[PDB]
Enzyme design. Structure first.
Site, PDB file in Angstrom:
ATOM      1  N   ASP A 147      36.326  35.097  25.144  1.00  0.00           N
ATOM      2  CA  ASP A 147      36.893  34.801  26.754  1.00  0.00           C
ATOM      3  C   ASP A 147      37.339  36.174  27.215  1.00  0.00           C
ATOM      4  O   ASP A 147      38.459  36.147  28.006  1.00  0.00           O
ATOM      5  CB  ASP A 147      37.952  33.926  26.797  1.00  0.00           C
ATOM      6  CG  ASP A 147      37.999  33.304  28.472  1.00  0.00           C
ATOM      7  OD1 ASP A 147      37.114  33.765  29.242  1.00  0.00           O
ATOM      8  OD2 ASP A 147      38.911  32.562  28.770  1.00  0.00           O
ATOM      9  N   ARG A 151      41.318  38.876  33.754  1.00  0.00           N
ATOM     10  CA  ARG A 151      42.270  38.033  33.732  1.00  0.00           C
ATOM     11  C   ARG A 151      43.334  37.555  32.952  1.00  0.00           C
ATOM     12  O   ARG A 151      44.392  37.177  32.590  1.00  0.00           O
ATOM     13  CB  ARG A 151      41.809  36.502  34.532  1.00  0.00           C
ATOM     14  CG  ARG A 151      40.739  35.723  33.618  1.00  0.00           C
ATOM     15  CD  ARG A 151      40.226  34.844  34.218  1.00  0.00           C
ATOM     16  NE  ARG A 151      39.129  33.995  33.300  1.00  0.00           N
ATOM     17  CZ  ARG A 151      37.664  34.624  33.148  1.00  0.00           C
ATOM     18  NH1 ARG A 151      37.471  35.470  33.680  1.00  0.00           N
ATOM     19  NH2 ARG A 151      37.084  33.903  32.166  1.00  0.00           N
ATOM     20  N   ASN A 152      42.772  37.816  31.606  1.00  0.00           N
ATOM     21  CA  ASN A 152      43.349  37.538  30.342  1.00  0.00           C
ATOM     22  C   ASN A 152      43.867  38.785  29.608  1.00  0.00           C
ATOM     23  O   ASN A 152      44.374  38.525  28.296  1.00  0.00           O
ATOM     24  CB  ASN A 152      42.177  36.758  29.379  1.00  0.00           C
ATOM     25  CG  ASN A 152      41.974  35.381  29.766  1.00  0.00           C
ATOM     26  OD1 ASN A 152      42.658  34.725  30.391  1.00  0.00           O
ATOM     27  ND2 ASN A 152      40.741  35.077  29.298  1.00  0.00           N
ATOM     28  N   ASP A 168      45.821  35.996  26.474  1.00  0.00           N
ATOM     29  CA  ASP A 168      45.509  34.673  26.222  1.00  0.00           C
ATOM     30  C   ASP A 168      44.332  34.532  25.232  1.00  0.00           C
ATOM     31  O   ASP A 168      43.275  35.148  25.331  1.00  0.00           O
ATOM     32  CB  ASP A 168      45.022  34.418  27.668  1.00  0.00           C
ATOM     33  CG  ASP A 168      45.033  32.616  27.701  1.00  0.00           C
ATOM     34  OD1 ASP A 168      46.160  32.075  28.123  1.00  0.00           O
ATOM     35  OD2 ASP A 168      43.922  32.451  27.570  1.00  0.00           O
TER      36      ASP A 168
END
Ligand SMILES: Cc1cc(-c2cc(C(F)(F)F)ccc2O[C@H]2C[C@@]2(CN)c2ccc(F)cc2F)[nH]n1
Ligand SMILES: Cc1cc(-c2cc(C(F)(F)F)ccc2O[C@H]2C[C@@]2(CN)c2ccc(F)cc2F)[nH]n1
Length: 290
Positions: A147, A151-152, A168
């Site tokens: 992922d 955003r992470n 994350d």
């Protein structure tokens, strides 16, 4: 959980007495719960919380994050300070990143007519180099993030000298909810077609991240939808360069997006190629768009 040749345990985490923890201000939402700035006794921390109203499957999910993040030892992966699981709501204590997430930082910092001279091309390479370093460490330790996205990612500070890190791991934990929730725009064909994930899965996602960084916070395949991307990519379609993106950078995105996984580079190569891009004046003297 296993990592680096060892099997971790719930006791191997460092339980922090609840009475020592003090929440300062809310910072947003996680995949499930919330996040806060915090203090431990004076240590500045970030506190991920598990909602009290949660399933018995969610409890185990929460623990797994703690175990996963705790066994990592790398400067480009957020550190896990400890846990406070013996009290309710269950806490996970993590390194605090004053720069906030990467996607927001890019959007908030876009050069604008008011204050154009904020960021430079060399800054974007360092962020990309930072994340490539962490991904290589994961690949070397046979961990598949699955992922990799802006955003992470988090930044230590907003100003010069910032370091970017992977912040994350909710996805790697979930696989170890549904289709409309799948990050389709970040996945290679064999992932969303067959469900196959390898280190070459993260190589593809990093290319999309690269595009995010040099578009300065834009959304991949901006005008398209998930299914339109799903048909666009399987047909061989790929995104165009971000505005003003130097060739050698885009060339990295295009190699990351090779259709067959064995035709994509590993993160050792990406890093080396990225460092080479920091060494080209014609690359780091290109001006960002307004
Ligand atoms: C683990 C951690 C979180 C923060 C954090 C710090 C700050 C501030 F600048 F104010 F300090 C601001 C936001 C922060 O994360 C918030 C944005 C969130 C929530 N979706 C987030 C984004 C990416 C990510 F990978 C993990 C996240 F939780 N620091 N450490
Ligand atoms: C499989 C793949 C490798 C690359 C690649 C990507 C980049 C970029 F800078 F773009 F990141 C730069 C170089 C790349 O390969 C170069 C290193 C070479 C040539 N000795 C190589 C090594 C092993 C291999 F199996 C194939 C190779 F061609 N792309 N795909």
């Amino acid at each position: 959980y296993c990592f680096a040749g060892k099997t971790s345990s719930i006791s191997d985490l460092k339980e922090v007495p609840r009475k020592n923890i003090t929440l300062i201000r809310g910072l947003g939402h996680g995949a499930f719960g919330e996040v806060y700035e915090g203090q431990v006794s004076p240590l500045q921390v970030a506190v991920k919380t598990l909602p009290e109203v949660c399933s018995e499957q969610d409890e185990l999910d929460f623990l797994m994050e703690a175990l996963i993040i705790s066994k990592f030892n790398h400067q480009n992966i957020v550190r896990c300070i400890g846990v406070s699981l013996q009290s309710l709501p269950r806490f996970i204590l993590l390194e605090l990143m004053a720069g906030g997430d990467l996607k927001s930082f890019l959007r908030e910092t876009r050069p604008r007519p008011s204050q154009p001279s904020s960021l430079a091309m060399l800054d974007l390479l360092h962020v990309a180099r930072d994340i490539a370093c962490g991904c290589q460490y994961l690949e070397e330790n046979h961990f598949i993030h699955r992922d990799i996205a802006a955003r992470n990612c988090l930044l230590t500070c907003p100003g010069p000298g910032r370091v970017a890190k992977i912040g994350d791991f909710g996805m790697a934990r979930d696989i170890y909810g549904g289709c409309a929730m799948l990050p389709v725009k970040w996945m290679p064909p064999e992932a969303f077609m067959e469900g196959i994930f390898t280190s070459k899965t993260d190589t593809w996602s990093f290319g999309v991240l690269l595009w995010e960084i040099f578009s300065l916070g834009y959304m991949p395949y901006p005008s398209k939808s998930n299914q339109e991307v799903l048909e666009f990519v399987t047909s061989g379609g790929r995104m165009d360069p971000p505005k003003n993106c130097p060739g050698p950078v885009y060339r990295i995105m295009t190699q990351c997006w090779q259709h067959q996984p064995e035709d994509r580079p590993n993160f050792a190569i990406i890093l080396e190629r990225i460092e080479y891009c920091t060494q080209d004046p014609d690359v780091i003297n290109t001006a960002l768009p307004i």
